[PDB]
Ligand binder design. Structure first.
Ligand SMILES: Nc1ncnc2c1ncn2[C@@H]1O[C@H](COP(=O)(O)OP(=O)(O)OP(=O)(O)O)[C@@H](O)[C@H]1O
Ligand SMILES: Nc1ncnc2c1ncn2[C@@H]1O[C@H](COP(=O)(O)OP(=O)(O)OP(=O)(O)O)[C@@H](O)[C@H]1O
Ligand SMILES: [Ca+2]
Ligand SMILES: [Zn+2]
Ligand SMILES: [Zn+2]
Lengths: 694, 146, 49, 48
């Protein structure tokens, strides 16, 4: 593996048809017999690992101990029609058959799977690199075919990305994707986060901020994968382990608990449908259930208690599953604003930014980067701004002891961490906890769950308060959420039209109060009339209540103007009210709703079209790549796959800096400097080498 | 077949075969596709309308019961909201079909201690149920056309 | 897919499909790796005929 | 109609240079090319 790594280093910055790549191919051809022997060593054991797990092999396996005789092994392998005689003999020799010629195939298969994995992967990387940079050499296709099984086995882990390198050219980078990383990226919650991020950037993003938003998404995704790994499941100590088990159980089943709470709300309301009010106990009235079963009276109490419990568990699951991500995002953006902007060193937000003003409480806390990975952001800000603003003043702002930096640099102290609640009491950072609770209580989802709590608790005061939990379908069902978004999209417009309707109704009220008062008698009695427009407030209420809801306007309700000196004026009044209020304004409201529907639909269509027509990374459209058949599909799956950029970032973070290659070190340095020029922008490997490749 | 055979049991079962134009005529098929394109959305809005009407029913049953007398007789009243199921049926049956919402059907709140609460009740019912939700349904149909 | 299991071993599975030798082709492709007799039992083939 | 007018105005500004008329596609060959062209090269404020 080390020798192959040296060769791959020789291929750094290697152009297509480069002399070093051609020399490498010549060296491999010069040693064709040995390269074929190595590739055969790998492919025999790769094939054997799956063969021993096959039903055809298990048919030959007959010993109850789980072992197989050498002759039975021989007749099983030639039945597979995948090895030759010498290869079967060599496998027999490699099998550690005992004196009884009994083979433990389970361990025989796994003996070389782990030791040979890294070298197999690097051989795959080397062959892929040589094939893609020397594409018109027939001598290399033989090696590629002989390593078909190796390349197939390592295809899901052979991650490739393209970057704009230090040589001002597009370079193609090969690295390893781990099984855990791919499995975690394929989780449905991560897929949903990716979809939401893509929608956000493509819909309401700019190209200048795109790569930075993408890298922020990658960082949040890494943190989410860590949280999922933590919550995943395969007297103080016992209580702590059971508490973490319980919290993880709640976190894993948060959505199931949410669904259960919704189902319980439906059951409670169904029971509530049977309520009945009577004067007789089961001048005050009495509310009770009216039924013959006799069971839903206690069933309602049981369901109410269970519902309150489930909602409480939902809040705990939320602040054990999502609050870490909220705090992580906020701490990360605060740290980057401190370091790369000097937000509280230079600009000092002007009291109109509540977020920035609340973040002042966490600057000097001892535990400010609790969720953010960079625990040295304070040190970095000091080293960057202490010269110009004052080291002591920066240290006072960030709550640093300038004395302890030296001793921490010198040596590491190992004190006694006593496992006592008494000793833990004053370890709490009260100011940081206040800041964190402010951030939590200002979060929409947490506020929703807290309101769900409050309504559930009020449900025990009065069982009808459980009707409010029926609104939970507005967020539980994505279709209903979209439908209500088709209302909330133009909410400001709707409120403005309602206000304008109020104003026009006020004008009509003014005109009526001045002139048409005699027509507003709403009493069939003759001696005690009920005049609705002898007071301006009463007239305005009458209008806003009956005129708007009347199909034909106010004229439907007020008296007939036939045979009056003001007949024509009143008919003009009625017709204009009907047209402006009933027709035009309600039409405006309904048109706002329909236009919100259309706007949402065209947003979704535009996002899908943008993804299917341009590459999310380079920006080159599908038209160029489709010059080669399936060109855009290959470009978006292999060359510029964004999942592979995510995987590359995790690979860099996990890899040791002393083991970084040249290209990896370049990308890593540029990433730490927050410079995104390594992303291919409008250029690609296929475009740069158009003439050599074609 | 089954409807034709039932037509011999009762000749009016032949009325069902008139629906055959839905598939026979491509124009009618497209027009009905302009309905079925967003069927899931339509059913969801109908369910949401049911839920909001249930909430209004809950509020009415708790507070505005005295206004739901639907009997012109004086000695045997017909109260539609003395039972929650009866009140919910009354709402889903008459309030939605009324042009001005439930306030068209229920009694006049003039000169009552709960007048303002009841007018807020009626106006909000008219706006959310009659205006916004039916507008959503019609907009779904028009958007399917487009 | 669960309903299509009933037609695998029928003698007349490709009645409308033109390829009457799909069973033979599947046997020649997968019998080595999964078992010729097991494939023949799945597809209702007589290996003797 | 009003909504599509606003969308068209925004799209035209974000896709073509107000002065030269060359679209953003050409300038985006260089990274941030259109942003630099509209801020430094052909900024209309600079013509004013
Ligand atoms: N740089 C890019 N990386 C990945 N996909 C891209 C890129 N540019 C454009 N796309 C488009 O993004 C689309 C969405 O990805 P795709 O559907 O293939 O992913 P998936 O993981 O198979 O599933 P899903 O349908 O949930 O996205 C692809 O059809 C592809 O054409
Ligand atoms: N020749 C041009 N000069 C300036 N802007 C141009 C030109 N051609 C196109 N544009 C586009 O005009 C848009 C509007 O300018 P921009 O938003 O950057 O200005 P601003 O002063 O920062 O604020 P505002 O958002 O109020 O316009 C820019 O996003 C830019 O892409
Ligand atoms: Ca090194
Ligand atoms: Zn690309
Ligand atoms: Zn220009």
């Amino acid at each position: 593996k080390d020798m192959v790594v040296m060769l791959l280093s020789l291929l750094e910055g290697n152009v297509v048809n480069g002399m070093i790549a051609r020399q490498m191919v010549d060296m491999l051809v010069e040693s064709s017999s040995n390269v074929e022997m190595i590739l055969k060593f790998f492919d025999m054991f790769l094939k054997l690992k799956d063969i021993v797990g096959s039903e055809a092999f298990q048919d030959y396996v007959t010993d109850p101990r789980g072992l197989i005789s050498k002759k039975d092994f021989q007749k099983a392998m030639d039945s597979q029609k995948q090895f030759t005689g010498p290869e079967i003999q060599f496998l027999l020799s490699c099998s550690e058959a005992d004196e009884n010629e009994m083979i433990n195939f389970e361990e025989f298969a796994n003996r070389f799977q782990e030791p040979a994995r890294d070298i197999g992967f690097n051989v795959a990387v080397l062959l892929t690199n040589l094939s893609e940079h020397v594409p018109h050499d027939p001598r290399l296709r033989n090696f590629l075919e002989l390593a078909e099984s190796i390349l197939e086995y390592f295809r899901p882990y052979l991650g490739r990305i393209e970057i704009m390198g230090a040589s001002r050219r597009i370079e193609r980078i090969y690295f390893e994707i781990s099984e855990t990383n791919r499995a975690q990226w394929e989780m449905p919650q991560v897929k949903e986060s990716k979809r939401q991020f893509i929608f956000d950037v493509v819909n309401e993003g700019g190209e200048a901020e795109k790569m930075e938003l993408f890298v922020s998404f990658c960082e949040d995704t890494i943190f989410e994968m860590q949280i999922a790994a933590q919550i995943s499941e395969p007297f103080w100590g016992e209580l702590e382990v059971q508490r973490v088990k319980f919290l993880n159980y709640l976190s894993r089943n948060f959505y199931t608990l949410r669904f259960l709470a919704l189902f319980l709300a439906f059951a409670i309301n169904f029971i509530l449908l049977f309520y009945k009010v009577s004067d007789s106990p089961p001048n005050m009235v009495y509310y009770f259930l009216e039924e013959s079963t006799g069971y839903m009276e206690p069933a309602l109490w049981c369901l109410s208690l269970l519902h309150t419990l489930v909602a409480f568990l939902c809040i705990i699951g939320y602040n054990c599953l999502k609050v870490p991500l909220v705090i992580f995002k906020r701490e990360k953006e605060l740290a980057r604003k401190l370091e790369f902007d000097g937000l509280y060193i230079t600009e000092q937000p002007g009291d109109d930014d509540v977020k920035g003003q609340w973040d002042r409480l966490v600057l000097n806390t001892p535990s400010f980067p609790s969720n953010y990975w960079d625990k040295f952001v304070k040190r970095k800000v000091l080293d960057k701004h202490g010269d110009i603003f004052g080291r002591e003043r920066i240290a006072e702002l960030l709550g640093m002891d300038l004395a302890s930096l030296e001793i921490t640099a010198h040596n590491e102290r190992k004190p006694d961490p006593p496992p006592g609640l008494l000793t833990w009491l004053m370890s709490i950072d009260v100011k940081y906890q206040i800041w964190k609770f402010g951030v939590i209580f200002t979060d929409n989802s947490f506020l929703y769950l807290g309101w769900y709590m409050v309504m559930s608790l009020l449900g025990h005061y009065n069982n009808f308060f459980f009707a409010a939990h029926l609104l939970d379908i507005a967020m539980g069902v994505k279709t209903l959420r979209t439908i209500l978004s088709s209302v909330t999209h133009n909410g400001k417009q709707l409120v403005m039209t309602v206000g304008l309707l109020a104003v026009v109704v006020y004008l009509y009220t003014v005109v009526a109060f001045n002139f048409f008062r005699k027509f507003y008698n709403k009493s069939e009695d003759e001696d005690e009339p009920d005049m609705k427009c002898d007071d301006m407030m009463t007239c305005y209420l009458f209008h806003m209540y009956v005129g708007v809801r009347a199909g034909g306007g106010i004229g439907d309700e007020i008296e007939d103007p036939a045979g009056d000196e003001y007949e024509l004026y009143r008919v003009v009044f009625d017709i204009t009210f009907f047209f402006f209020v009933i027709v035009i304004l309600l039409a405006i409201i309904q048109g706002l709703i329909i236009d919100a529907f259309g706007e949402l639909r065209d947003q979704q269509e535009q996002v899908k079209e943008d993804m299917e027509t341009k590459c999310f990374i380079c920006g080159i459209g599908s038209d160029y790549f489709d010059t080669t058949p399936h060109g855009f599909e290959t470009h978006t799956l292999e060359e510029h796959n964004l999942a592979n950029y995510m995987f590359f970032l995790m690979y860099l973070i996990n890899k040791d800096e002393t083991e970084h290659t040249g290209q990896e070190s370049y990308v890593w340095k540029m990433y730490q400097e927050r410079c995104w020029d390594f992303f291919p922008a409008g250029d690609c490997f296929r475009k740069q080498y158009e003439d050599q490749l074609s």
